[PDB]
Design a protein around this ligand. Sequence first.
Ligand code: A1CEV
Ligand code: ZN
Length: 419
Amino acid sequence: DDKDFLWPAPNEEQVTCLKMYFGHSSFKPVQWKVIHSVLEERRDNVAVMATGYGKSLCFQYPPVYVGKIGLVISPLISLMEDQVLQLKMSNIPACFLGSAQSENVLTDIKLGKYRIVYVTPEYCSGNMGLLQQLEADIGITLIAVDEAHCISEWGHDFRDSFRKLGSLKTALPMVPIVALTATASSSIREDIVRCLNLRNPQITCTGFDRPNLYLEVRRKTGNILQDLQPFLVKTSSHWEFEGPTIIYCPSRKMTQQVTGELRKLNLSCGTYHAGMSFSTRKDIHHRFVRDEIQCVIATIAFGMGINKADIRQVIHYGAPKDMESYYQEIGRAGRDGLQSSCHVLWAPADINLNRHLLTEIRNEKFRLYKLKMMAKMEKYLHSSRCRRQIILSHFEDKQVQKASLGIMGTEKCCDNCRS
Ligand SMILES: O=C(Cn1c2c(c(=O)n3nc(N4CCOCC4)nc13)C1(CCN(C(=O)Cc3nc4ccccc4o3)CC1)OC2)Nc1ccc(C(F)(F)F)cc1Cl
Ligand SMILES: [Zn+2]
């Protein structure tokens, strides 16, 4: 069951609703992330998606489940017409709202007869008073802004119509905005978050097969220098990795240890852990971005703000917490699209493997969730199957494995695909 690997667990009516109106068994981790953060946290989202495969459910499902109203703001007229028809045929009442259509649909929208209203950014700019009325009389579950990259002057597909969608948060500060786009440009999403005036936005990135990441799992011995020696190359007196390198460790003690023995070879490296000031941390980034230091030995803490294109190696010195955290950590590697490697070095005596450590948690539901996650991360590490296939299976939809051409099976895919 996939529903086991979601936190919170989608309730029984949520599952019923998905099968009834969309015809699916379970939510994928990213879909659930976006949907739940909309419904329960009312949190602005930026959803990066390489295709429209599982893209619609993110903004269509929420207003259907609560039975209120969702607003999709898009310039893609014919794509909007196809989705309006698909919703109508799935017994979801939906319309295209524009100046031409207004006389037939507007009264019905105002009296709450539509779950999902598609509009152009042109039309939306004029009728902010209509939006405030709908918030007041029904309540708007969310506003989806598709092709959100069109708000950016520095993007490749700029649209004048998008300029005044900034006023949505001024007009509706309580209503969450789901900004959708097909570009993984870090500068454009900063334009999207800025121009749409988004607050503490959840960022997600799916539909990409990351063919330039090689995955390996490898038994850890005990001796640190023994374990890392394979990854090291000397140039004169000092030692160095082949490129920019991140070594995530499960404990704060380990980051100090690993950094300790890596220093003895005069390696250009530094720590980044929980128990320190958000001041020394600021420089380590700027050093690492400017290639002043080569390696960073960190915990789960380091990563969220990393925009470094040329990360060549990620190493998990010890089994990671779970697949969620692992997916995030490896996802930072090789953003430039050049060959990078992601190695796990694990032993059975790692703190994220012992089950009789989580028995301390007395909340039944949460304890069972953490055990399913530990079991599944364990199943991945011991696997003799394709590391990429396990990860795509769990995180991405079926059509990302199908669309994944000419990497799975090759000597650059994973240790299991090699031998
Ligand atoms: O790689 C991806 C998707 N993807 C992800 C991230 C990312 O950066 N990129 N970057 C890409 N590229 C797509 C292709 O073009 C280059 C960039 N893809 C992803 C992140 C996003 C979330 N994140 C955070 O720390 C939060 C956060 N980020 C922020 C950025 C700015 C500001 C605030 C932020 O807050 C961790 C990194 O995780 C997913 N999928 C994937 C596909 C196949 C395989 C396989 F090979 F194993 F099979 C493994 C994986 Cl992981
Ligand atoms: Zn493989």
